[PDB]
């Protein structure tokens, strides 16, 4: 995960509710996004050095309270990431439900090339 180039891209819709690997202690009833890096493709030159860009496959999750809100959030995320300089969405969203808090979820993978430094 390269934080800033994802947070600045997804801030306007979610009003800055993007967090790395964990939701805060009191996240509220509004939709929010959690991203996490789950692998990638190597970019390591055999001569003994690695390039200044590196691939990384991030995961995304939106957790609203109403089904329509999470559907709109996911479709907006997919559009904004498919119309982006170096990212590309692979796969389709998968839904999830949390009975204890009564919130609806979603999940989709993203392939992105970020700047290592």
């Amino acid at each position: 995960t390269y934080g800033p180039i994802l947070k600045q891209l997804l801030s306007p819709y979610f009003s800055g509710r993007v967090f790395p690997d964990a939701a805060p202690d009191v996240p509220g009833q509004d939709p929010y996004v959690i991203y996490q890096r789950v692998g990638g493709i190597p970019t390591y030159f055999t001569e003994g050095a690695l390039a200044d860009k590196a691939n990384a496959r991030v995961q995304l999750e939106v957790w609203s309270t109403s089904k329509q809100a999470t559907y709109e959030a996911m479709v907006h995320i997919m559009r904004s990431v498919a119309a982006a300089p170096a990212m590309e969405p692979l796969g389709q969203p998968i839904d999830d439900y949390e009975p204890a808090l009564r919130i609806y979820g979603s999940r989709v993978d993203i392939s992105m090339y970020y700047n290592l430094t």
Partner: protein, 211 residues
């Protein structure tokens, strides 16, 4: 033991026209070029006729006046006297960067087939000849604004042999004499970056300049 394939950096150099004719290659010791004025430490081609195993190999002038990388003490297959020997000086080396996984391919041996009828069991004979050519491949990651790109494309267009170096991180080398093909065209894939391929081919034996 167990030489490892990590840190290997390739590179190629053109063959110039400056020539010499130093004589006096001695079979006993690591061969010596008697009285050559070439500064010790220059990679020089050897194209001396009348000898079998020193036809188109490459070496460096080092030590006192010897060309390390030769072991012509065997003489049952090395008859005659040295006489005249050619020495062409090789230019400077341009080093590849952003390389992938080299994969040597080929180098099989083609037997002979045929049988002697007299054998009661009908044994079939296999006689070894004609070892296949051995190539090499070296995928690179494309970038137009790099020193190796223009040099490789030009050396492809020239259509002449070059001198390929395979530099181990230890400090040794393995010089070869052979052609050099290049692609110079994008090879788009599913998600990996644009890849570029540079094929090799060796027309003689390989040397090892110990260091």
């Amino acid at each position: 033991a167990l030489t490892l394939p990590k840190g290997i950096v390739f590179g190629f150099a053109p063959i110039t026209s400056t020539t010499s004719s130093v004589t006096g290659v001695t079979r006993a010791a690591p061969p010596v070029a008697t009285g050559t004025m070439l500064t010790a430490g220059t990679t020089v081609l050897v194209r001396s006729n009348t000898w079998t195993g020193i036809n188109n190999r490459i070496s460096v002038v080092d030590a006192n006046k010897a060309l390390q990388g030769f072991d012509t003490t065997d003489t049952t297959t090395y008859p005659g006297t040295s006489g005249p020997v050619e020495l062409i000086t090789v230019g400077a080396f341009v080093n590849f960067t952003q390389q992938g996984e080299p994969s040597t391919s080929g180098g099989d041996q083609q037997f002979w087939n045929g049988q002697l009828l007299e054998d009661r069991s009908g044994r079939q004979l296999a006689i070894p000849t004609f070892k296949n050519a051995k190539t090499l491949t070296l995928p690179l990651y494309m970038d137009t604004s790099l020193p190796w790109y223009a040099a490789a494309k030009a050396a492809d267009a020239r259509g002449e042999p070059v001198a390929v170096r395979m530099l181990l991180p230890n400090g040794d080398a393995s010089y070869n004499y052979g052609y050099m093909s290049f692609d110079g065209d994008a090879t788009i894939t599913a998600n990996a970056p644009i890849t570029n391929v540079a094929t090799f081919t060796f027309l003689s034996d390989s040397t090892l300049v110990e260091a």
